C-alpha cells in the first residue's frame, strides 16, 4: 500500500519513487494493476534498516522483489516472514549468518557477494533459484548447492574452495566464476555443456583435461596459474577471448588453430616463436610482453591489430612492424632495438614505450604526429632531434611512464644539458633556437722608460722588443684571467739616444735616486708622445738609500695616467699594478674586431717578418684579400698593427718603396747608425754604413739612408758628409731631438764645421753679415742664442701637444 510506502519514507527520511523494473541500485517501488506493491529497493539505507522496516514489510503480502544492497547490515533475522519474495539483493554487507534465509520457499535470484558468509547450508531449501552471486566470501566448502538445480549463473569466486565436485550435480549453468580460490582439479567441470563464460583465474591448476568437453565457451580466463600445455585448447575454436597471462608455456602452435579470437593476453612466459600467430587476422589486442622471443616478422600479417605489448623481449629489428597501420599502443621497451625508422608509417600510434633499449637516433619518429605517449628512458641517446619538440606533449625527467608525456631518464644527453631537458619543452625549444642563432686581440706592448732595466729583466727570467706570455711573467701567472695575453717589452737608455717614435700600451717609468732630478723629462715624454697609456712609476735600488721616497701623491695628481701604481722595491706588487693597468678602457687588450682582421694581421706579420717592408700595392692586395678597401677600415687596421708594435707605419715616410716596416730590424738599424763612435765625433763617413752594420745589405743600406733623412734626424750636406746633431728660451722636458731638427738647415747660416754635438755656430749668408751660435744644455734644459732662428725653433717645436715653453 502507498500508505506503507509513505510510512517507510518518513521512517527513513528518503524519497522513494514510483519506478520500473527493479535494479540492484534502485531506491523506489513498483506497482501493479490495482496498485499493489511488489518490488521495493532500499539502496544504502543505513545499517539499522532491516530491524526497523520488517513490520511494514510484512504488512503488505504482495512484495516479491527486495533490494537491500550495500546497506552494511549484520543481522538478517527479520528476513524470515516475507515468504512472498522472488529476488533478493544483499551485496556488500557485513552478513555472517544466513540461517533466516530458510523459510523463503520462493526465490529465483540471490545476490550476496560483498558479505562475510561462511556457511551456505541454510539455503538448501531454496529450490527454484536461477542466479547466485557468492563471490569474495570466507566459504570453504560447497555441499548445499548440490541440491540446488536450475541454476544458470553462478559466482563462487574469492573464497577458500578446494573441492568443487558437487557442481557436477548442477547441470544447467551458463556462466561460472571460480577464481581466487585454492583449486587443483577441474575434473567435475566435464559434464557441463551449456557454459559460455568460464573464469578459472588464480589457482594451482596445471592440467586442463576436461575443458575439451566444453564447446560453447566464448570467454576463458586462465591466468596466474602453473599451466604448461595448451594443446587441449587446440580443438575449440569458438572463444572470442582467451586470456593466458603469467604461466610457464613454451609452445603456442595449438593457438594457431583459432581464427575468431579477438583479444589475446600472452604475458610472462617462455614462448620462443610467435609464428603460430600468423593466421589470426582478426586480433585487435595482443599482449606479448616479458617473454624470450626474437623475431617479429611473423606478426607482419595481422593488420587488424590495435594494441601491441611486446616489452621486455629479445627483439632487435622492428622493420617487419611497418605493415601494420591501425595501431594505437606499442609497448616494446626493455629490448635491444637500435633504429626506429620502420615506424614512421605508423600514422595511428597514440602511446609508445621504447625505453631500456640501445637506441641512439630518435629522428625517424617524426611524422607520427598522433603520439599521445612516448617513453625512451634508459637509452644511449646523444642528440635530440627537432621533431622531438614538435609533439603535443610536455617533457618530464621522471622515472614514471605516464601518458601524454615525453620522458627521459638515465640518458647521456651531451649536446642538450640534462638540466635544460628537465626544465621543460619550452626550455628545450629556447635552448635549441639559441643554438640555431666576435674575436678579441689579447695583446699589449710595454715600453720600459729609464734614464734598472736589467732589474725588470730579472722579472722576465734585452735590447727592447721581447715577447712574453702569462706563464712567462713571475707573480702574474696565478691569475687565469689573463692566461691568453701577449706582452711586448721594449726598453732603451742613454744620453743622445733619442727615438720618440721607434695608447695600446703600458709604460712603467723607472727611477733611481741619483736620476730623480731629471724626473719630469720622461713623465712629460709619456704625456706627449706614446698615447693615453696607463703609467706605472717604479723606484728601484732602494737598498742603497732605504730612507728615500718620492712624493708619489703630487706626481700622481699631476699625471692622471698613474692612479697610484707605485713600487719601492730593490733588486711583487709589480704584477698587481701591471694587471690593473692592462685592463683599462684607455688601453687595448680586449678589443672586439672581426676575425678577418686577425687573419689579415697574421698574413701581414708573415709577409713583414721576411720582406721587412711592404708596398702600398701589396698592402691593398692583402687588405682586399678579405675584401676590405675602406680607407678608414684599413687605416684602423694598420693603426692597431702599429700601436701594438708588430708592424710599424708612419704618415711621414713619403716613400713608395716602403709602406709599412718591421720594428725588429728597421729600428735596430737606426740604433746602429745613430751611434757607432764615428757619429760621436759628429760626422759620419760618405757611405761607410757597411762598416757600421755588417740580413742587411747595400740595398737595405740606402733604404735606411733614405729613411733616416726622412725621419728628420740628419742631413747629407755634401761629398758624403753627415751631421747627426744628436735668446734665452727655457723648456720643461727639453726635447732630445730639437738640435737635430734645428741643424737640418746646413746650407744656411754656418761658419765652418763648428758643432758641439750639443750646439753649433752660424754665419749669415743673407744681407749684411751676422755671426750666430745656438747651443744646448741638457743639465739645465735650456737653449742659448748668439748674435729666422726663432722661426725654425717654432717650426720644430710645433710638432708637440701642449708643450710648455719659457722665454727670457
Amino acid at each position, epitope marked *: 500500500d502507498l500508505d506503507v510506502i509513505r510510512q517507510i519514507e518518513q521512517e527513513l527520511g528518503m524519497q522513494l519513487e514510483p519506478v520500473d523494473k527493479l535494479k*540492484w*541500485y534502485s*531506491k523506489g517501488y513498483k506497482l501493479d494493476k490495482d496498485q499493489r506493491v511488489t518490488a521495493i529497493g532500499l*539502496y*544504502d539505507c543505513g545499517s539499522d534498516t532491516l530491524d526497523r522496516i520488517i513490520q511494514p514489510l510484512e504488512s503488505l503480502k504482495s512484495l516479491s522483489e527486495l533490494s537491500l544492497s*550495500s546497506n552494511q547490515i549484520t543481522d538478517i533475522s527479520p528476513l524470515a516472514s516475507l515468504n512472498s519474495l522472488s529476488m533478493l539483493w544483499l*551485496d*556488500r554487507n557485513q552478513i555472517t549468518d544466513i540461517a533466516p534465509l530458510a523459510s523463503l520457499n520462493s526465490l529465483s535470484m540471490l545476490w550476496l*557477494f*560483498g558479505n562475510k558468509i561462511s556457511d551456505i547450508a541454510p539455503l538448501e531449501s531454496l529450490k527454484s533459484l536461477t542466479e547466485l552471486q557468492l*563471490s*569474495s566470501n570466507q566459504i570453504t566448502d560447497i555441499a548445499p548447492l548440490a541440491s540446488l538445480k536450475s541454476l544458470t549463473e553462478l*559466482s563462487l*569466486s*574469492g573464497n577458500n574452495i578446494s573441492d568443487i565436485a558437487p557442481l557436477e550435480s548442477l547441470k544447467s549453468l551458463t*556462466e*561460472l*566464476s571460480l*577464481s*581466487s580460490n585454492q583449486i587443483t582439479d577441474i575434473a567435475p567441470l566435464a559434464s557441463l555443456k551449456s557454459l559460455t*563464460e568460464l*573464469s578459472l*583465474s588464480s589457482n594451482q591448476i596445471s592440467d586442463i583435461a576436461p575443458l575439451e568437453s566444453l564447446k560453447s565457451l566464448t*570467454e576463458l*580466463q586462465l591466468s596466474r596459474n602453473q599451466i604448461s600445455d595448451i594443446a587441449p585448447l587446440e580443438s575449440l575454436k569458438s572463444l572470442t577471448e582467451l586470456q593466458l597471462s603469467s604461466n610457464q608455456i613454451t609452445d603456442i602452435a595449438p593457438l594457431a588453430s583459432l581464427k575468431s579470437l579477438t583479444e589475446l593476453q600472452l604475458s610472462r612466459n617462455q614462448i620462443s616463436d610467435i609464428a603460430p600467430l600468423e593466421s589470426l587476422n582478426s586480433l585487435s589486442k595482443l599482449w606479448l610482453n616479458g617473454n624470450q622471443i626474437t623475431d617479429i616478422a611473423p606478426l607482419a600479417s595481422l593488420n587488424s591489430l590495435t594494441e601491441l605489448e611486446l616489452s621486455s623481449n629479445q627483439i632487435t629489428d622492428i622493420a617487419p612492424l611497418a605493415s601494420l597501420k591501425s595501431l594505437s599502443t606499442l609497448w616494446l621497451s626493455s629490448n635491444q632495438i637500435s633504429d626506429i625508422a620502420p615506424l614512421a608509417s605508423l600514422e595511428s600510434l597514440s602511446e609508445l614505450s621504447l625505453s631500456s633499449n640501445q637506441i641512439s637516433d630518435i629522428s625517424p619518429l617524426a611524422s607520427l604526429n598522433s603520439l599521445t605517449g612516448f617513453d625512451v628512458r634508459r637509452n644511449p641517446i646523444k642528440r635530440l632531434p627537432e621533431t622531438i619538440t614538435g609533439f603535443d606533449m*610536455e617533457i*618530464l625527467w*621522471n622515472d*614514471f611512464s*605516464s*601518458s*601524454g*608525456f615525453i620522458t627521459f631518464f638515465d640518458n647521456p644527453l651531451e649536446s642538450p644539458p640534462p638540466e635544460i631537458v628537465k626544465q*621543460g619543452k619550452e626550455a628545450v625549444r629556447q635552448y635549441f633556437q639559441s643554438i640555431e642563432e666576435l674575436v678579441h686581440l689579447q695583446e699589449i706592448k710595454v715600453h720600459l722608460i729609464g734614464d734598472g732595466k736589467t732589474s725588470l729583466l730579472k722579472q722576465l727570467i734585452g735590447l727592447n722588443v721581447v715577447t712574453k706570455q702569462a706563464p712567462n711573467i713571475k707573480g702574474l701567472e696565478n691569475d687565469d684571467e689573463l692566461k691568453e695575453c701577449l706582452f711586448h717589452f721594449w726598453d732603451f737608455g742613454g744620453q743622445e739616444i733619442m727615438h720618440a717614435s721607434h695608447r695600446s700600451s703600458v709604460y712603467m717609468l723607472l727611477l733611481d735616486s741619483r736620476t730623480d732630478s731629471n724626473k719630469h723629462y720622461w713623465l712629460r715624454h709619456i704625456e706627449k708622445y706614446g698615447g693615453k697609456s696607463p703609467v706605472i712609476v717604479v723606484m728601484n735600488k732602494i737598498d742603497e738609500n732605504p730612507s728615500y721616497n718620492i712624493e708619489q701623491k703630487k706626481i700622481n695628481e699631476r699625471f692622471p695616467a698613474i692612479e697610484n701604481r707605485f713600487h719601492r722595491i730593490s733588486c711583487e706588487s709589480i704584477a698587481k699594478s701591471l694587471k690593473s693597468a692592462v685592463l683599462h678602457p684607455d688601453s687595448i687588450y680586449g678589443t672586439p674586431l672581426a676575425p678577418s682582421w686577425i687573419k689579415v694581421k697574421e698574413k701581414l706579420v708573415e709577409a713583414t717578418t721576411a720582406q721587412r717592408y711592404l708596398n702600398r700595392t701589396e698592402v691593398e692586395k692583402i687588405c682586399n684579400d678579405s675584401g676590405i678597401t675602406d680607407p678608414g677600415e684599413r687605416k684602423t687596421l694598420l693603426g692597431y698593427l702599429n700601436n701594438l708594435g708588430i708592424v710599424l707605419y708612419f704618415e711621414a715616410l713619403d716613400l713608395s718603396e716602403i709602406y709599412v716596416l718591421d720594428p725588429h730590424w728597421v729600428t735596430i738599424g737606426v740604433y746602429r747608425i745613430i751611434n757607432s763612435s764615428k757619429t760621436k765625433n759628429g760626422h759620419l763617413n760618405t757611405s761607410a754604413l757597411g762598416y757600421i752594420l755588417n740580413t742587411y745589405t747595400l740595398l737595405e743600406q740606402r733604404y735606411l739612408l733614405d729613411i733616416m733623412k726622412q725621419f728628420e734626424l740628419c742631413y747629407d750636406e755634401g761629398k758624403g758628409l753627415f751631421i747627426i746633431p744628436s735668446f734665452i728660451m727655457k723648456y720643461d722636458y727639453l726635447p732630445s731631438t730639437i738640435i737635430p731638427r734645428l741643424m737640418i738647415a746646413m746650407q744656411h747660416q754656418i761658419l765652418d764645421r763648428m758643432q758641439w754635438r750639443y750646439g753649433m755656430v752660424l754665419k749669415s749668408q743673407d744681407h749684411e753679415g751676422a755671426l750666430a751660435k745656438v747651443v744646448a744644455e741638457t743639465k739645465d734644459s735650456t737653449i742659448t742664442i748668439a748674435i729666422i732662428i726663432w722661426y725654425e725653433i717654432k717650426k720644430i717645436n710645433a710638432n708637440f701637444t701642449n708643450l710648455d715653453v719659457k722665454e727670457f
Partner: nanobody
Amino acid sequence: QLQESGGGLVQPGGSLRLSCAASGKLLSINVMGWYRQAPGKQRELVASITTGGRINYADSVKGRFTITRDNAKNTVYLQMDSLKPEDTAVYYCNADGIIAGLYQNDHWGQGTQVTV
C-alpha cells in the same frame, strides 16, 4: 581495467580534468574515485563517489577538487583547480566492481603524473 586520460605540468593556480573510463568488463561499480602518490609517501584517498550519489572527500582537498560521474558510461572526472605545489604527484583510479564474475573492492589504474 581503468584507462585514465589527462595529467601534465600546470602552473600553480591552474586547472586540470583527469578522466577515468572503466572497460566494459567491469560490471557493477558501486564506489569509484581518485587516489594519489607523492614521492616518498603513501596512497591516500582524494575522492570517492557512489552509484547512489554519496561523495567522500579527503578533508585536505575539500572545496578544491570536484568529482563527477556518469553511470550510463562508467566514467569519473576529477576537475582540479588552484593546484598548490604539494599536489605534484601521480594520481590513480580506484573502483569496486566485477570482472568475469569476480568482485574486488580495489581495482587500480596505471596512474598519471600531475606536476606543478
